Structure 1
Amino acid sequence: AFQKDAKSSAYSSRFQTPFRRRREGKTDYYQRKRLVTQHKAKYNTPKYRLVVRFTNKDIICQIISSTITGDVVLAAAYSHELPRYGITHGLTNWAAAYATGLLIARRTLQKLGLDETYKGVEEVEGEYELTEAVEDGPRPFKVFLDIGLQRTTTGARVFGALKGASDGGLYVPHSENRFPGWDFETEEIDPELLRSYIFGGHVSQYMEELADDDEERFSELFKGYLADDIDADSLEDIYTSAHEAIRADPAFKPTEKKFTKEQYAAESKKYRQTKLSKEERAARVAAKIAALAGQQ
């Protein structure tokens, strides 16, 4: 190609490829080693990661342990399941992150039989507190936050999901200086601002501001709120009822899966180019050579 594209044979030969998930830019292996590596004097104890990822339009919350063959998911919770609990808009905001953390916490505790014990913070007030072990009883299920490549900032939705999982009764070691409301100038967090974020107060205040200001912007954003008759002041009770429903039934009813996997595969196979055989490659080479009766 150019004088620097189509790299030299020696460069290609001596190039060492990174791990595939490093090439893809998806796995920080430096962080993963420290997240996954277990104290050798426990010999089987899986280290459980609360893996929180944010795609556009969805929040993924998994609880993952590591094996040689690959990571194993104990429980998973997605923000696209929040419509079942009564959240249909802002499925990637801070309140949805908190809801998904609460959902994964409740679902995992139910799966482990630790739902009745370790109820968590049912009365949410935005206070910083960890899940405490019960006297003469099993210790709380301990997981470690895995933000992946997401940057650690004060107010991040990943720490929203952390707060949700911790309030749900999972013991997730954490500090409070990354929550919204943490006063960087002092040593304490603003619990009312944290609770506001938990219940979507920032979004509702934006809705009211945009209403009292130019209205075509409030018809472009929050259009679904207008079409669903969701006023700004209803967000707090929407998220409250969502938390109650999550605690009531965090049992992961899956989707009905219409067009079953065989039909899925059959339909996907039509738009799938298949590799040519060596006979076909030789035939194409012969065709290209014979195309020069003279020279082009």
Structure 2
Amino acid sequence: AFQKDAKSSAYSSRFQTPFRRRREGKTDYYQRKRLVTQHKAKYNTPKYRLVVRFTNKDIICQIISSTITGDVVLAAAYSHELPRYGITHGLTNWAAAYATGLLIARRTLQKLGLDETYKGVEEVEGEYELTEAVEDGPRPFKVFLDIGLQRTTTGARVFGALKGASDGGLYVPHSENRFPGWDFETEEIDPELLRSYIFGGHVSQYMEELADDDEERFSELFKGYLADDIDADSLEDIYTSAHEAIRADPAFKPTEKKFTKEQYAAESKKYRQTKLSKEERAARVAAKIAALAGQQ
């Protein structure tokens, strides 16, 4: 709208631009530095970070360790791959996040070999307990929670993702207070509420609450569930047998794709336009002087 305030020649010339990953607004550098910087006496020994991000209708979770060329992934795990584990609808919720975390844990440590040892907890009773130390035998694999920008509050699915991670074998150090059902008024964890949360108990209770409150909103939501024959008291058991679907075979089988990269290139390049040349530009300028200036 405005060109009276005027981003002038002078102002532009002496403008410093941030970093691209900050100019998008996607990477907190102040945090990132503090996170990734290794204790220099360890040398090349890398620091691994459990990246967890939540888009609208996906969860991304990836262990990354850095290198000055660019930050290299150890392994990745997504929520939209949960279909072949047996969870389809309602897939970016707290329980789903937990599941994703679990998958990433069991995956990375599977591919690193140890898995057999350091199975962690496999009760999932919602108790605050970390990956222990096996006396006589290798240390457990360590990795730190990278949130990025997603704000920290008690109850967030960020923390579900951590819970899933830690329980599934990977050492992520953490305090309890930001898991759901932490009593703020006195240092008293309730594991049973947390327990309920882990298997989508909040969601199931919500479904129960739309029995006689309203049943058009109920139809608006949960449409897929109605289609697939899913209901309240089945829900807690859906995540339960699906956890063992991870703990037998978590091995990452990628999609069949169909077509190859060249085909995709062929598709894409049709729509996006190329640049130009100098000659073409000069011609256009000539046209513009004919039409506007010379006036036919």
TM-score normalised over the length of structure 1: 0.97
2:260 matched residue in structure 1: 260
1:72 matched residue in structure 2: 72
Residue 2 of structure 1 deviates from its aligned partner by: 2.4
- Specify the SS of the correspondent of 2:150: coil
Name the CA distance, whole Å, in 2 between partners of 1:226 and 1:200: 17
Question: Residues 209 and 262 (structure 1 numbering): CA distance in 2 closer, same or farther, change over 3 Å?
Answer: same
1:144 aligns with 2:136: no
Name the CA distance, whole Å, in 2 between partners of 1:280 and 1:123: 70
Out of 171-180 and 186-195, give the one that drifted further. Answer: 186-195
Question: Residues 233 and 27 (structure 1 numbering): CA distance in 2 closer, same or farther, change over 3 Å?
Answer: same
Residue 251 of structure 1 deviates from its aligned partner by: 0.3
Residue 295 of structure 1 deviates from its aligned partner by: 4.4
Residue 294 of structure 1 deviates from its aligned partner by: 4.0
Question: Residues 233 and 6 (structure 1 numbering): CA distance in 2 closer, same or farther, change over 3 Å?
Answer: farther
Name the CA distance, whole Å, in 1 between partners of 2:294 and 2:161: 70
Unaligned runs of 5+ in 2: none
Name the CA distance, whole Å, in 1 between partners of 2:267 and 2:40: 48
Residue 6 of structure 1 deviates from its aligned partner by: 4.8
Name the CA distance, whole Å, in 1 between partners of 2:5 and 2:49: 41
Residue 211 of structure 1 deviates from its aligned partner by: 2.2
Name the CA distance, whole Å, in 2 between partners of 1:4 and 1:114: 65
Aligned length: 296
Residue 164 of structure 1 deviates from its aligned partner by: 0.1
Name the CA distance, whole Å, in 2 between partners of 1:74 and 1:212: 49
1:286 matched residue in structure 2: 286
Name the CA distance, whole Å, in 2 between partners of 1:98 and 1:4: 53
Question: Residues 263 and 5 (structure 1 numbering): CA distance in 2 closer, same or farther, change over 3 Å?
Answer: farther
Residue 120 of structure 1 deviates from its aligned partner by: 1.2
Name the CA distance, whole Å, in 2 between partners of 1:235 and 1:188: 28
1:22 matched residue in structure 2: 22
Residue 188 of structure 1 deviates from its aligned partner by: 2.0
Name the CA distance, whole Å, in 1 between partners of 2:197 and 2:135: 32
- Specify the SS of the correspondent of 2:41: coil
- Specify the SS of the correspondent of 1:53: strand
Deviations 1:17-74, CA, capped at 9 Å, x for gaps: 0000100000000110011000000001111000000000100000000000111110
Residue 121 of structure 1 deviates from its aligned partner by: 1.1
Residue 279 of structure 1 deviates from its aligned partner by: 1.6
- Specify the SS of the correspondent of 2:219: helix
Out of 258-267 and 33-42, give the one that drifted further. Answer: 258-267
Question: Residues 293 and 191 (structure 1 numbering): CA distance in 2 closer, same or farther, change over 3 Å?
Answer: closer
Residue 182 of structure 1 deviates from its aligned partner by: 0.5
Residue 292 of structure 1 deviates from its aligned partner by: 3.1
Residue 278 of structure 1 deviates from its aligned partner by: 1.6
Out of 70-79 and 276-285, give the one that drifted further. Answer: 276-285
* Root mean square deviation of aligned Cα: 1.2
Name the CA distance, whole Å, in 2 between partners of 1:198 and 1:63: 22
Question: Residues 151 and 294 (structure 1 numbering): CA distance in 2 closer, same or farther, change over 3 Å?
Answer: same
1:195 aligns with 2:195: yes
Out of 245-254 and 280-289, give the one that drifted further. Answer: 280-289
Residue 171 of structure 1 deviates from its aligned partner by: 0.3
Name the CA distance, whole Å, in 2 between partners of 1:248 and 1:170: 17
1:6 matched residue in structure 2: 6
Residue 235 of structure 1 deviates from its aligned partner by: 1.3
Name the CA distance, whole Å, in 2 between partners of 1:20 and 1:14: 18
Name the CA distance, whole Å, in 2 between partners of 1:280 and 1:288: 12
- Specify the SS of the correspondent of 2:114: coil
Question: Residues 5 and 197 (structure 1 numbering): CA distance in 2 closer, same or farther, change over 3 Å?
Answer: farther
Matches within 5 A, 1:1-296: 2-4=2-4, 6-292=6-292, 294-295=294-295
Deviations 1:239-271, CA, capped at 9 Å, x for gaps: 011111011111000000112111011101111
Work out the percentage of aligned pairs sharing the same amino acid: 100
Question: Residues 5 and 133 (structure 1 numbering): CA distance in 2 closer, same or farther, change over 3 Å?
Answer: farther
Name the CA distance, whole Å, in 2 between partners of 1:247 and 1:60: 20
- Specify the SS of the correspondent of 1:291: helix
Residue 273 of structure 1 deviates from its aligned partner by: 1.1
Residue 144 of structure 1 deviates from its aligned partner by: 0.3
TM-score normalised over the length of structure 2: 0.97
- Specify the SS of the correspondent of 1:254: coil
